[PDB]
Amino acid sequence: EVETFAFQAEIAQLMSLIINTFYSNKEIFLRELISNSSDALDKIRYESLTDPSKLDSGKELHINLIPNKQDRTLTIVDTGIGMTKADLINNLGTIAKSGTKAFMEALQAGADISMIGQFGVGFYSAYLVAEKVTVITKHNDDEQYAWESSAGGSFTVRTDTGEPMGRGTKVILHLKEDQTEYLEERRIKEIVKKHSQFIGYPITLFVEK
Numbered sequence: 001e002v003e004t005f006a007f008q009a010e011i012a013q014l015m016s017l018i019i020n021t022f023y024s025n026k027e028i029f030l031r032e033l034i035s036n037s038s039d040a041l042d043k044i045r046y047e048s049l050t051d052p053s054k055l056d057s058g059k060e061l062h063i064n065l066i067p068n069k070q071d072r073t074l075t076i077v078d079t080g081i082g083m084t085k086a087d088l089i090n091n092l093g094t095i096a097k098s099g100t101k102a103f104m105e106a107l108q109a110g111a112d113i114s115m116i117g118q119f120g121v122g123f124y125s126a127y128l129v130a131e132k133v134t135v136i137t138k139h140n141d142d143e144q145y146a147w148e149s150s151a152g153g154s155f156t157v158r159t160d161t162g163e164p165m166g167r168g169t170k171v172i173l174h175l176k177e178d179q180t181e182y183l184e185e186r187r188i189k190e191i192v193k194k195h196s197q198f199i200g201y202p203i204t205l206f207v208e209k
C-alpha cells in the first residue's frame with residue numbers, strides 16, 4: 001500500500017529552486033542533515049531526562065555515515081526521536097511553509113543557499129546532490145514508515161517492511177551520477193571536520209570492502 005501525496009506549493013517551489021539554481025558549494029547538505037540528526041538526538045535526550053523509559057527502544061545516541069558505491073547511496077543514520085506518520089506527511093516535522101517564505105525572501109535580499117538551515121528547511125538541501133531521497137523513521141508512538149521523493153511535486157509514504165530500526169531516522173541519498181565524490185572516505189571526512197566538528201554526539205564514518 002503506497003500513498004502518493006502532493007507537496008505544498010511553497011515546498012515544491014523550494015525543491016525546484018534547490019535543483020535548478022546553479023550553486024557549486026553543494027557539500028553543505030551533509031552539515032544540514034547532521035544538524036537535523038543532532039536536533040533529533042537532543043529531543044529524545046530531553047524527553048529521557050524526565051522519563052528514562054523512552055530510551056527502551058535504544059540507549060545509544062549516535063550518528064553513522066554509511067557510503068555504498070555499489071548502490072551509489074550515502075546514508076545518514078541517527079537514533080534520535082524519530083518521526084510519526086503525521087510528522088512525515090507534515091513536511092518531515094518542520095514548519096516548512098513559513099520557513100520557505102523567509103528563505104526565498106532572503107535569497108533575493110543578498111542571502112545564498114548555504115544559509116538554508118537558518119530557516120528550518122535544511123533537509124531539502126539533500127536534493128543538491130541526490131536525485132531521490134528515501135527516509136526510514138521510527139518514533140516511539142508510531143510504526144516504521146518509508147518516505148520517498150524524486151522531487152517532481154510528489155512524494156510517497158508506506159509502512160516499512162524491512163529491517164526494524166528501534167528508534168531514529170535513516171536518510172538514504174541516491175546520489176546523482178556526477179556527485180559520487182561524496183562516497184569517498186577522505187571527502188566525507190573533510191566535510192565533517194569542516195562543518196560539524198562540534199556536534200555533541202559520536203559520528204562514525206563506515207568504510208567499504
Ligand SMILES: O=C1Nc2ccc(F)cc2C1=O
Nearest residue numbers: 188189190192193203204205
Ligand atoms: O567523518 C568523520 N567522522 C569523525 C569522527 C570523529 C572525528 F574526530 C573526526 C571525524 C571525521 O572526519
